[PDB]
Design a binder for this molecule. Structure first.
Ligand SMILES: O=C(/C=C/c1ccc(O)c(O)c1)O[C@@H]1C[C@](O)(C(=O)O)C[C@H](O)[C@@H]1O
Ligand SMILES: *Cc1c(COP(=O)(O)O)cnc(C)c1O
Length: 809
């Protein structure tokens, strides 16, 4: 029906129909009379997968024959979402599959909704890994994503009586048609044991063995016939494990628990043994695979054929594991092995919050990984000898830079290990990378300035425009053609349409159509009744104090109080939508969800407010829900305290999809404003330097309460039970934190936020000028393609040239 979805040729549709029927009969063992909607989805998925396999086999052969440098992207999280539609998009099959399914009496969009998200990540870090795989394949790089096949991904969120409840995400229950088990590449991973020194060096002995079984998933590039691999490891017990008899067999579960569940902690490090086991498991299995593939081409060439990218410190044990293999097993001298290791590894940092840094207790590493601890101590001693020679007498610098932190419990600082053992260290937006050089890693920058880089984050325009917003993709394609989908800078050409009355109308119509469709989805799945003429004000992301959902809540209560004070005054109607998951042990984040729902309970049932203000908590925010809500948004809330959000990527998704942004000068917001023009962004609040100045004097929240009567009224409403009438003190923890212990200075940005929100409302009353500003944002969003990001990694870190040429079909 629309050009960006491809051709529906006669031969193609006919063939798709016959293969669909073949899978329904032979694969699923059903006839049309007893087939359930789930059967139809599986028949379709198997049909589409059949089109990947020839290209997958041919791509992997091509890499064997050409022998390029291989890129290994190591991550504990891959937040992939659904695969069916993405696969159709990248193989240009969407219109054909639509027509084929239509002709069988089926609605393809309905079948798409049956697929489970692959929710193998928490938020931004996991999704960046998924966007990166898509871009690496689209740029023709010989790239592999390596992680863990968690049996249970991020929990499904239910809201009961306004409180978050967690339930298990049993995403594999019905099977996964995209993965291929590769039991023949099963490898042993070792734990515990002890170290014996011999004439022939050290030996790690008396270990427990767990098997790592790989499952491969295809990663198709955009219309270029490249299909790369994501390899995920699953834990299996050996067959003699513990071998009364019954209990020995049941105890196999202890080994297999390694790959059972994703830790749901976004930004709060816990030193749990099971998590450490996951980290080593993924590293040890992956490195054996890497070395195997390298041997089937002398270790001096290893960094010419291999790059390893560490997605945060979670796979940081790759550094001492590579040293262990090179020294203990291959018998390279230390200095040679270290040179190879450093030249092979690179590290990406994703946060500056100190509570998110991995600092493992020494006693844990000593029991679990005794040889690795010895290697780490040796790395540290040699590293500090270099620091001492560069900065003689600077004894305090030696303690600050050490990998080993002294204290009540000794710990290993994993970030310090990653810097020491990597040839490149990068942050994820310009301001963040600057902050790394000036503050937390200043000592390391002074020692080795050349290591430190920036690579500003991006998002894939396949998932985040073509897939989720085909209406927008099409009206763009009508004027500038299709090339922009793999070269997003071509969106700049849209600036010449900013005064085009037809283009203005089309852009605004697409937003309206997306809003209507989203409003309908709300009514159907969640019984909720919104006004699609209102401004859609959305904040979706994980719930954390630094992201300041609480600041949004204060604004919502302010509008409510203004309405109550002057009920017969006109106000621009809003639907305020907030969604996101809280980590199960994070009490304050759970209290914030309850506050949002309790505000909703008052505001949504006040007859004086009417349809002028609605507050909705979007349950179970995940990749598939992001694809629905983001195209429907008018206003994107990106309101973290300056200095706390390393980059953000939700921000970029909203910009691409025709929302305007209200935000602080934080993370990538800075670069987004710079690209669009500050006049086309709603910027407010303290800059990083203002936060610094306040810290030096001391933040006193009382001063703001004392000086702003509107803020004082809200705090008194919260305290006295206005929003919790049956439990008057329900929110006293929230009040106490804001008044006495707020690390993120919510009150300090309140006045400027409210004023800036009044300017947003003023512009929304003038649809033509609203839409013109939107066009200026979409037109300048090209920098934020993950294709640009990956090209920079490839050239500046990995030493490989991207390619846009097709492989033969
Ligand atoms: O998602 C994470 C961290 C996850 C994490 C930390 C510690 C753990 O122990 C853990 O299990 C997870 O950071 C993201 C990264 C980001 O989306 C990006 O570059 O992609 C940029 C954002 O600003 C955001 O802060
Ligand atoms: C993009 C995305 C995120 C990251 O959003 P931020 O606003 O950058 O934290 C988190 N969760 C999901 C499901 C996403 O798609």
């Amino acid at each position: 029906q629309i050009s960006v979805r491809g051709l529906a040729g006669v031969e193609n549709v006919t063939e798709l129909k016959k293969n669909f029927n073949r899978h329904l009969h032979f694969t699923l063992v059903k006839d049309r009379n007893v087939a359930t909607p789930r059967d139809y989805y599986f028949a379709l998925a198997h049909t589409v997968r059949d089109h990947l396999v020839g290209r997958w086999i041919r791509t992997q052969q091509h890499y064997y024959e050409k022998d390029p440098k291989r890129i290994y992207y190591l991550s504990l999280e891959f937040y992939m979402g659904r695969t069916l539609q993405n696969t159709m998009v990248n193989l240009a099959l969407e219109n054909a599959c639509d027509e084929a399914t239509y002709q069988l009496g089926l609605d393809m969009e309905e079948l798409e909704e049956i697929e489970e998200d692959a929710g193998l990540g928490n938020g931004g870090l996991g999704r960046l890994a998924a966007c990166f795989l898509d871009s690496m394949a689209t740029l023709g790089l010989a790239a592999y994503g390596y992680g863990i096949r968690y049996e249970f991904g991020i929990f499904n969120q239910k809201i009961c009586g306004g409180w978050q409840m967690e339930e298990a995400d049993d995403w594999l229950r019905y099977g996964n048609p995209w993965e291929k088990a590769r039991p023949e590449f099963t490898l042993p991973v070792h734990f515990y044991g002890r170290v014996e020194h011999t004439s022939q060096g050290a030996k790690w002995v008396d270990t427990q063995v767990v098997l790592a079984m790989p499952y491969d998933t295809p990663v198709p590039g955009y219309r270029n016939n490249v299909v790369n691999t994501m390899r995920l490891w699953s834990a299996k017990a050996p067959n003699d494990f513990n071998l009364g008899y019954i209990q020995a067999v049941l105890d196999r579960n202890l080994a297999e628990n390694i790959s059972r569940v994703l830790y749901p902690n976004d930004n709060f490090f816990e030193g749990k043994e099971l998590r450490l086991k996951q980290e080593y498991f993924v590293v040890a299995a992956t490195l054996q695979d890497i070395i195997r593939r390298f041997k089937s081409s002398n270790f001096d060439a290893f960094p010419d054929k291999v790059a390893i990218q560490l997605n945060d410190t979670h796979p940081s044990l790759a550094i001492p594991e590579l040293m262990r293999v090179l020294v203990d097993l291959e018998r390279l001298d230390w200095d040679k092995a270290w040179e190879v290791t450093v030249k092979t590894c690179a590290y990406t940092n994703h946060t500056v919050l100190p509570e998110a840094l991995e600092r493992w207790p020494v006693h844990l590493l000593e029991t679990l990984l005794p040889r690795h601890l010895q290697i780490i101590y040796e790395i540290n001693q040699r590293f500090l000898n270099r620091v001492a020679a560069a900065f003689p007498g600077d004894v305090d610098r030696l303690r600050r830079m050490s990998l080993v932190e002294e204290g009540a419990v000794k710990r290993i600082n994993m970030a310090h290990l990653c810097i020491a053992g990597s040839h490149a260290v990068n942050g994820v937006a310009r301001i963040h990378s600057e902050i790394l050089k000036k503050t937390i890693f200043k000592d390391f920058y002074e020692l080795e300035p050349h290591k430190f880089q920036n690579k500003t984050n991006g998002i894939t325009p396949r998932r985040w425009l073509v897939l989720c917003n085909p209406g927008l993709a099409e009206i763009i394609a009508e004027r500038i053609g299709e090339e922009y989908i793999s070269d997003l800078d071509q969106l700049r050409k849209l600036l010449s349409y900013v005064d085009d009355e037809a283009f203005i109308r089309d852009v605004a119509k697409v937003k309206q159509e997306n809003k209507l469709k989203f409003a309908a989805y709300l009514e159907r799945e969640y019984k909720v009744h919104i006004n699609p003429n209102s401004l859609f004000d959305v904040q979706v992301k994980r719930i954390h104090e630094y992201k300041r959902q609480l600041l949004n809540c204060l604004h919502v209560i302010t509008l409510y109080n203004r309405i109550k004070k002057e009920p017969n005054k006109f106000v621009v109607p809003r639907t305020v939508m907030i969604g996101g998951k809280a980590a199960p042990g994070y009490h304050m984040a759970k209290m914030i969800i309850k506050l949002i729902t309790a505000i909703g309970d008052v505001v949504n049932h006040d007859p004086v407010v009417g349809d002028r203000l609605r507050v909705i908590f979007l349950e179970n925010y995940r990749v598939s829900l992001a694809e629905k809500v983001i195209p429907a948004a008018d206003l994107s809330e990106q309101i973290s305290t300056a200095g706390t959000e390393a980059s953000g990527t939700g921000n970029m998704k909203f910009m691409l999809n025709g929302a305007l942004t209200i935000g602080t000068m934080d993370g990538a917001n800075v670069e987004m404003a710079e690209e669009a023009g500050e006049e086309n962004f709603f910027i407010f609040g303290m800059r990083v330097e203002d936060v610094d100045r306040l810290d030096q004097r001391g933040y006193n929240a009382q001063e703001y309460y004392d000086r702003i009567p509107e803020l004082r009224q809200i705090i008194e409403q919260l305290s006295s039970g206005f929003f919790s009438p049956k439990q008057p003190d329900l929110f006293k923890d929230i009040v106490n934190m804001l008044m006495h212990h707020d690390r993120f200075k919510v009150f300090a940005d309140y006045e400027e936020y409210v004023k800036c929100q009044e300017r947003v409302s003023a512009l929304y009353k003038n649809p033509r000028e609203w839409t013109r500003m939107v066009i200026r944002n979409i037109a300048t969003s090209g920098k934020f393609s993950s294709d640009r990001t990956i090209a920079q990694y490839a050239r500046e870190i990995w030493g490989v040239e991207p390619s846009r040429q097709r492989l033969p079909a």
